[PDB]
Amino acid sequence: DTKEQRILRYVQQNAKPGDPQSVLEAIDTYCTQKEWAMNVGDAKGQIMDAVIREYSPSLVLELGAYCGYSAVRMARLLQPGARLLTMEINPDCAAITQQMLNFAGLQDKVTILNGASQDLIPQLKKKYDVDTLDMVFLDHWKDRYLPDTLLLEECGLLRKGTVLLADNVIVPGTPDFLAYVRGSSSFECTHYSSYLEYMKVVDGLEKAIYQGPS
Numbered sequence: 001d002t003k004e005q006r007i008l009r010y011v012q013q014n015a016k017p018g019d020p021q022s023v024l025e026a027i028d029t030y031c032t033q034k035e036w037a038m039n040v041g042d043a044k045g046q047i048m049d050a051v052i053r054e055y056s057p058s059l060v061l062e063l064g065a066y067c068g069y070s071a072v073r074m075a076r077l078l079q080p081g082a083r084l085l086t087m088e089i090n091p092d093c094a095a096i097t098q099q100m101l102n103f104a105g106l107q108d109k110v111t112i113l114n115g116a117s118q119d120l121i122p123q124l125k126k127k128y129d130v131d132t133l134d135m136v137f138l139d140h141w142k143d144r145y146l147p148d149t150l151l152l153e154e155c156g157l158l159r160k161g162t163v164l165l166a167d168n169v170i171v172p173g174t175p176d177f178l179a180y181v182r183g184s185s186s187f188e189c190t191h192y193s194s195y196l197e198y199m200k201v202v203d204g205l206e207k208a209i210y211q212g213p214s
């Protein structure tokens with residue numbers, strides 16, 4: 001069975017229920033013991049944490065859930081009443097993420113949406129009563145970063161000050177998304193280097209703050 005399910009089992013077998021930190025450490029510990037790169041890791045975690053704290057978003061959209069590590073990371077730093085929406089293309093991953101959130105005790109703060117972001121995103125306003133997003137974390141298929149950013153604008157889901165945080169923009173790389181947010185006055189960009197201690201390589205995140213229709 002899948003890596004994500006083995007991650008879930010290890011957490012459920014060892015972590016402390018209702019303790020987000022216990023859950024994150026268990027996930028990290030296991031993924032290192034397995035030498036699986038597919039994890040966000042804790043140094044990227046810090047940069048996510050810093051962004052979540054800085055802009056204290058009331059509504060966050062996450063693209064890609066996987067085993068739910070990033071959902072747990074962000075949801076634990078959401079202020080009372082703030083909410084997270086998470087899109088995930090693989091039903092099992094979505095199921096695992098639900099369970100991961102459950103174990104962390106954070107399920108009340110998150111809504112998991114099943115499907116392709118391209119199909120789900122245009123439904124956010126009508127079907128999920130979204131006005132606009134405060135933050136968007138991009139961590140799904142690298143070839144969807146740019147199309148979904150464009151799609152979010154078209155759907156009027158971004159406002160002035162909406163924070164896009166994009167992970168893995170160097171490794172494996174999203175050069176198209178970078179060229180667009182850095183090249184357009186619609187965004188203000190900050191780059192964050194982040195060493196991957198297992199790939200032995202320098203990855204990065206990009207923070208792009210929407211400026212409005214520009």
Ligand SMILES: Cc1ccc(-c2nc(C)c(-c3ccn[nH]3)s2)cc1
Nearest residue numbers: 064065087088089116117118140141
């Ligand atoms: C045309 C098209 C194809 C695929 C996607 C994807 N939407 C999401 C949430 C994906 C993902 C990656 C990891 N977990 N979930 S992939 C969107 C549009």
